Amino acid sequence: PKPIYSYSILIFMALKNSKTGSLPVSEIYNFMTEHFPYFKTAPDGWKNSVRHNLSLNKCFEKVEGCLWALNPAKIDKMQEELQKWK
Ligand SMILES: [K+]
């Protein structure tokens, strides 16, 4: 049962559910496997898809196993994208 969601939306859920708005890459996996059981048995490559969407989407920024944080300037746009698909 694939989630009716994009990878950027799923990453946005994991990061906005963080108290600091930032998580390491391993925590994003744990969030997706916990809240969406499809990824527990999904074929390999979705973990690589998460790292691609982190680098490609401007909403996620690398802080300087690192951490990925939400860009406050892109939260309103990603939120509106979240609501459309809820
Ligand atoms: K990025």
CA of 34 to the centre of ligand 1 (A): 24
Residues facing 11 on adjacent strands? none
Q: What is the DSSP letter of 32?
A: H
Where in the sequence is the domain holding 45, given as residue range(s)?
1-85
CA of 31 to the centre of ligand 1 (A): 19
Q: What is the DSSP letter of 59?
A: T
Determine the Cα–Cα distance for residues 8 and 50; give it in Å rounded to an integer: 8
CB 70, CB 59: distance < 8 Å? yes
CA of 54 to the centre of ligand 1 (A): 5
Number of domains the chain contains: 1
CA of 46 to the centre of ligand 1 (A): 17
CB 67, CB 26: distance < 8 Å? no
CATH code of the domain covering residue 37: 1.10.10.10
Determine the Cα–Cα distance for residues 35 and 62; give it in Å rounded to an integer: 24
